[PDB]
């Protein structure tokens, strides 16, 4: 069942594509803390930029998960 | 001053703990399925078989097993092997 | 006795002024009580592990051992890795002993 | 029938006062434009009862989850949040409460090539809110089981009360792991209820009624 | 947040209501400066106006092309259309260049601003030319400054400033060009 | 420093935020030092101009 | 107790630190310049607080050396 | 038994995406310490952003663990 | 069936380009937050540069995903 | 013994996610030293945030150690 | 068919050299944001500098994608 | 002998999680130098945080070496 | 024929050295932006520094490509 | 021909150090721009340090390129 | 082959240190020689890792 077996290690190697988006979400949500510690008055505009920048790099993780589930179940 | 008024009423449960214990017990007993390692058998089989054969080794583990997997009872040797 | 009043008084005195950090001295060897409970804690852990093992020592371990054997047993049922084989050997060691 | 008498200034009363006020401070009410007087007081009351009771819900979830977490550190006890159905059912319940509150605001109607990726990133927080609590309550307990299995090899193999530095260096490690599990048991209830306030207070927004007619100056 | 927009013009208008009317408006420090920060211009290519000031002197006011400022992170340089900056200077050498010729002022510290209109205002207390320091008394004083080390953090902070200024003076006097 | 001075500077953002603060510590301390230096300079120039007048 | 640079946390103001640095730069100057840099170094004035309107004790400065390096 | 071998080693190569999350959350929880040492007067705003950033970056870790559980026991 | 198996484990050993793409998106949309936290006056032109940087570093994301379409299906 | 070998070569590959949490705790406890070297008057709040960050990233460390024994003994 | 199976594994694991390139263009297009947030006078010249950097660090993306066609289709 | 040969490469692949603590300890112990060169007055409190961060980061090296010890010696 | 298959599976893991070259080019072409944003009159000299560094890292990029050619055609 | 296969798949995983020296050279040639934009009147000494650093960083690259042929052709 | 991947980390560390030398020399060019002494001392102290990961390679190859 090597055709069945290879998809598991393939998707296992493919979900490593979320390690870097975890690191990037960490540096972005740390940069928001260090930037909102400059001026607390613009700290609604900063979180409004943070969730936009999250939702356009979480989509990279979701593209990784779409490739994971089209290798696994397609 | 008021310290001896509160020592009179001793321990008391929270004021609705009866309903919580009744709800958790009614969730753990009104399951609608057999009781975790049993199987509903016919009346002829329950009337015909000994209580030593109704038991299973997997459901009576030993209380301090000298070897892991020691079971208290041994069940029926009439297996389907 | 009063079944709960003497017990409360006795545990109160044992909890508060009974100290083995003063009845045994121990300030020469230990620095402060913040270090004493950090060693009494792991001491309670160690003597609990040792009493729980010593209370039934002839047992095949459920925990994976490190390939080490306790004493002069070394091939018997208390060290046999497959537990069914170890039970088959224990059922022979039992009727002899 | 006859309720019990309560001492004022009891320690559980002060603790639950602080806890409820902490979770009520998370989604604060919004200041209007007109200063609050008898004219604006029905607008303030009717803004107050269109907002969800996230204070009460969040301290409900804080109390049940910190009690179920700290059960796992009592002797002879499991944590109930270590069960998959329990912890993930609480997570799905908070996500579903936020979703029902956000659906009842519009019309109970469910909301091109991008917004399905926003819907999947919103539907996943149902999984994440409960699975974070369950995996945190399972992982520390599992690691504690494995490492006190490894600590149990040494007094079994060596003598009882013998070769004490080798077992000391693992019993100290096990003690620090149970301390870390106490810290995680408090923090995961805190994180669950903080996220309940966030996810539910995303939909906790209505129109201030205000004055529609005014005698100015 | 800025609900009191003052200035010379607003104070002129409000001051004509509470003071007696025969009194002329008191002057302001704005009235003797033709140069501002937001007033764009004053750049003209490569050379920029360097207002090297002092409480007891004006050491330079003509336009220069590159200034080396000794900030507290380290020595940095200012070319013409530099980014706006408010830089605190550690004791170091402010180098004024007009080309190949460099005049080296060793200053005592004190701030140096770069404005949006490219004007740079070096603002230090004691700004000596490095010609007029002797190389003997600096280590002669640092030997004593490395000795009186009390627990008095006022005197210890003065000792820290002493050893740091003296060390920077030494490292600037051995390293002549 | 920010007791009223930067509070008088913030318009659609701020005008002080154009500058890169190159201090050791935060902006709240570089303005703390900078206004004491401004007071010393203004007081020195005031009592020098007043003596000559 | 305060939060700032090394002079600011020690209770010292910035102006005292910068004048201490100016004084220590002045003390090592050239002898055609060090004597005339002593003119810009002298602190001679006095002060007196006024609590009730006209009473108050006096505080006199006679300093030819510079700013006091000791605590204020 | 090659499929039930490849599932185990695929989960083992699947869970290494917990590295990048565990470093990004390190830089975010260090940025919290730094920005709360800059101005401590907003240190419930910045902790409130630290926990939003932690809880929105660890959704990546739970995506990784879901791919782990779905290539182990699914 | 080693060909149809190994093209799936190959395209599964391929997607972690998206990891570093997401880490770059994280540092970029965090540098946006620091930059607009410094001066909020140009806080829309910075987001324009952020989206242009997004769309020109996604280039690498689509360059990875079309190539893993070439491994999965071509 | 293909799966009983595969669990060992997966579990060895499973624990390399601890490198990310080690680097994360390194930077998060270095940021503590920088933050307590800036202003040592607030130096006992920052240790309190370092222990919160340490606990919420040892979260992810114990996640990786959960799967390293879920594919060994489970 | 280990030749074609192996070359599809090779062209799979080839494109994970796009990870660090995605992180590189992310760092570049992020420091573009605070470079424009420092002085907005130069931002159209500065994004010209950024795109001159982009069109030469994309050369690594082309250098990784031509070897994928050299592996698959040569 | 595929299991005892498996555990050796399992331990070899397992011990590369020490690289993350070997970089995190390096960046924390350089963070202490860059934080003590700023204020050398209070540079002995910060070593009390250096050793605390070193202990709580070593904990990961301890976990990695015990997963190594358990893969090798069950 | 494991040799002509190992050619491709080794070339795909040979070209993985382009990720570090992409990250290095990205931080250099991001520091080009930062440095030309400080004093934008040295921007010609800084672009001349960026292209020299870009050439001296294309040294190692073309070394990686000469290795990926030498294990395909030599 | 398994040994000549192993030499090629070992040289492929042996040229991975070129990513590390590429990223190191990139941060060094970005710091060249940053330091030359601090004080441009020291830029020739900075290039005299940059090319020494390049030549000494490529020592690691040639020590790695030493083994990429010493396992192939020796 | 896979043993010499540890030279990637030594190359990254040396590039970081020789970039920090360029920054620290651009911050006080008076002290632009003692820092290079610390630079080459730290470089020789991180060639320990390079020569360790080379002696493992010939202890793999020749043993």
From TrEMBL, chains A, H, I, J, K, L, M, N:
In the record, biological process GO terms are:
proton motive force-driven ATP synthesis
Q: In terms of one coarse class, where is the protein primarily found?
A: membrane
Molecular-function annotations in GO:
lipid binding; proton transmembrane transporter activity
Localization (cell): Membrane; Mitochondrion
Zinc-finger as UniProt keyword: no
What residue ranges are annotated as transmembrane? 8-34, 46-73
Membrane topology note: Multi-pass membrane protein
Claim: Membrane is one of the keywords in the record? yes
Q: Which UniProt keywords apply?
A: CF(0), Hydrogen ion transport, Ion transport, Lipid-binding, Membrane, Transmembrane, Transmembrane helix, Transport
**Would you name any one GO CC term?**
mitochondrion
User: What domain of life does the native source organism fall in?
Assistant: Eukaryota
Domain V-ATPase proteolipid subunit C-like residue range list: 9-71
Which protein family is it in?
Answer: Belongs to the ATPase C chain family.
From the Swiss-Prot or TrEMBL record, give the protein name.
Mitochondrial ATP synthase subunit c
Q: Which organism is it from?
A: Polytomella sp. Pringsheim 198.80
Measured against the full-length protein, the chain present covers 54 to 127 of 127
UniProtKB/TrEMBL annotation, chain D:
Q: How does it sit in the membrane?
A: Multi-pass membrane protein
Entry binding sites for Zn(2+) 4:
145
Binding positions for Zn(2+) 2 per the UniProt entry: 141
Question: Where found in the cell?
Answer: Membrane
GO molecular function terms attached to this record: proton-transporting ATP synthase activity, rotational mechanism
Family label: Belongs to the ATPase A chain family.
Describe the task this protein carries out.
Mitochondrial membrane ATP synthase (F(1)F(0) ATP synthase or Complex V) produces ATP from ADP in the presence of a proton gradient across the membrane which is generated by electron transport complexes of the respiratory chain. F-type ATPases consist of two structural domains, F(1) - containing the extramembraneous catalytic core and F(0) - containing the membrane proton channel, linked together by a central stalk and a peripheral stalk. During catalysis, ATP synthesis in the catalytic domain of F(1) is coupled via a rotary mechanism of the central stalk subunits to proton translocation.
Q: Kindly provide the name given to this protein in its UniProt entry.
A: F-ATPase protein 6
Tell me the organism: Polytomella sp. Pringsheim 198.80
Q: Which classification does the entry list for the species?
A: Eukaryota, Viridiplantae, Chlorophyta, core chlorophytes, Chlorophyceae
Q: Which gene encodes it?
A: atp6
Automatic annotation (TrEMBL), chain E:
Domain (ATP synthase F1 complex delta/epsilon subunit N-terminal) spans 50-120
The GO terms describing molecular function are:
proton-transporting ATP synthase activity, rotational mechanism
- What keywords are annotated for this sequence in UniProt? Hydrogen ion transport, Ion transport, Membrane, Mitochondrion, Mitochondrion inner membrane, Transit peptide, Transport
Task: Return the GO cellular component terms, semicolon-separated.
Answer: mitochondrial inner membrane; proton-transporting ATP synthase complex
Localization annotation: Mitochondrion inner membrane
Q: Which domain of life is it from?
A: Eukaryota
Q: Which family does it belong to?
A: Belongs to the ATPase epsilon chain family.
Q: What is this protein called?
A: Mitochondrial ATP synthase subunit delta
Q: Which source organism?
A: Polytomella sp. Pringsheim 198.80
TrEMBL record, chain F:
Look up the coiled coil feature and give its residue ranges: none
Subcellular locations according to the entry: Mitochondrion inner membrane
Superkingdom field: Eukaryota
Q: Which family does it belong to?
A: Belongs to the ATPase gamma chain family.
- What name does this protein carry? F-ATPase gamma subunit
Native organism is Polytomella sp. Pringsheim 198.80
Q: Which residues of the full protein are shown?
A: 213 to 265 of 317
